[PDB]
Amino acid sequence: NLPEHWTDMNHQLFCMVQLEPGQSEYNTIKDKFTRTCSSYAIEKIERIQNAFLWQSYQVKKRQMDIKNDHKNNERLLFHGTDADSVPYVNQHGFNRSCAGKNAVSYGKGTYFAVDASYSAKDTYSKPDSNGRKHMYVVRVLTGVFTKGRAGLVTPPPKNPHNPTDLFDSVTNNTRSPKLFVVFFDNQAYPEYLITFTA
Amino acid sequence: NLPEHWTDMNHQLFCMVQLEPGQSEYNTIKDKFTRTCSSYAIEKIERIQNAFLWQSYQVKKRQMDIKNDHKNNERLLFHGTDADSVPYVNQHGFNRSCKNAVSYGKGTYFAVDASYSAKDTYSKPDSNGRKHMYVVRVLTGVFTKGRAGLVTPPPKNPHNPTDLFDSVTNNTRSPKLFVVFFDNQAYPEYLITFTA
Ligand SMILES: O=c1[nH][nH]c(=O)c2cc(OCc3cccc(Cl)c3)ccc12
C-alpha cells in the first residue's frame, strides 16, 4: 500500500528523500510556501517516507471517508517547529501531549496553519544555532469542523444529546479558516520538511 | 477483516453484544474476573464490536510484531471507569487527555488484576450501585519501569532517542499495572457490569 512515487527503501521502514528544484513536486511546495513567505529562502525540501505513520494515517482517512457524506476530509497545511522536535516528528509524527499552548488557544491539540507565514513565526519555527528554520507540510484530516474553545481536549460533539459523535477538528473561524487543531494520533501525516533561512 | 467470534452487525460498524451466560466466551471472561473478584456480583458481560477501533488497533499490532520481531506484544488487562465515560470508551477507546494517580507517566493505566480496577476510585459505583470494568487487549510490547512526568515511554538506548519502549510498568519483574501513551494501543474487548 506504500505510494509508487516513493523511492524503493530496500526493505527499510523510514527514509528522508531530498527533492530537486525544477521537479513539479518541489515547485508546488516551494510555490505554496512563497505565496506568504516571499521574504525567506528555502535551503532544501525533503519528502518524509515513514511506512508505519502512512499506514495508520491511511486507515483513519478511509474511516473518515466512510463516516462523512462525500466530504473532502484532507487539507495540506503547515507546522513550524524547533530543531529538537524534528527527529521525533520524522519518526512518530505529531503528539498533542508535546504541543505548546497557542497565543490564541482554540483547544489543547496539535496546531496546523493554512498560510506558511503563520508557521514561519520564530515562536513556532524557532531558528536553530545555524539560523535554520523548520516547517512541515502536512496532510491533515480536518473532516467536518467547528470553531474551537480553549477548554477542549477533544473536538466537541455535533449534538449535545449525543456526546460521542464528534466533529473531526476545530478552527479559529469556519467562514475563513486560518488554523486547524486535531486531538488524535495519526490524524496528520508529515509529508515534507522545509528547511529555510531569513 | 473482523474477528470470527463477533456476531453479524447488519452492515453497521459499532455494536455492544450481551454474552449468553454458560457459553465458552462468557465463561472465559467471567473466570478472568472471578480469579480476584469472586466476592462481586456480575450483572452482565458485553462484547464490544467497534470495527474502526479494531482496524486501527490491529494495524498497531502488526507494526509492533514486525518491529519487535518476537511476538508476545499483547496482554489482556483491566480498566475500571465511571458510568459517564463508558459511551466514550465504547466508541473511541482510551484517551490519555481525559486526575487519578499518574506516578508512572501521563498515559492510560491498565491493571493485571480485576481487583485493582474494581476499586471505587476507578470503577465508581453509579446512583444504582453499578460498577463498570473493561477487559482490554493492550500492546505492552517491550516495557521498562515508568516515572512521574513521562509523556511517552523512555528510549531503549540513550544514543538513539526516537527508538522507544512500547509501554511502562510499576515493576518489570512482577508488573501489576501498565501505562500506554498512544491512541489505538488498547482495544476495549468486553465490558463487565457488576456490583459489590
Ligand atoms: O482501572 C483503572 N482505571 N483508571 C485509572 O486511572 C487507573 C489507574 C491505575 O493505576 C494508578 C496508580 C499509579 C501509581 C501507583 C498505583 Cl498503586 C496506582 C490502575 C487502574 C486504573
Curated annotation (Swiss-Prot), chain A:
**Which cellular component terms (GO) are annotated to the entry?**
cytoplasm; nucleus
Q: Where in the cell is it found?
A: Nucleus
MF (Gene Ontology): NAD+ binding; NAD+ poly-ADP-ribosyltransferase activity; NAD+-protein mono-ADP-ribosyltransferase activity; NAD+-protein-aspartate ADP-ribosyltransferase activity; NAD+-protein-glutamate ADP-ribosyltransferase activity; nucleotidyltransferase activity; transcription corepressor activity
Result of altering residue 79 to Y: Abolishes catalytic activity
Name a biological process GO annotation.
negative regulation of transcription by RNA polymerase II
Where does the source fall among the domains of life?
Eukaryota
PARP catalytic domain: from which residue to which, for each copy?
Answer: 2-198
Which keywords does this chain's UniProt record carry?
Glycosyltransferase, NAD, Nucleotidyltransferase, Nucleus, Repeat, Transcription, Transcription regulation, Transferase
> For this UniProt entry, what is the primary localization, expressed as one broad class?
nucleus
Q: Which family does it belong to?
A: Belongs to the ARTD/PARP family.
Function in brief: Mono-ADP-ribosyltransferase that mediates mono-ADP-ribosylation of target proteins. Acts as a negative regulator of transcription.
- Name of this protein: Protein mono-ADP-ribosyltransferase PARP15
Q: Which organism is it from?
A: Homo sapiens (Human)
Which residues of the parent protein does this chain contain? 481 to 678 of 678
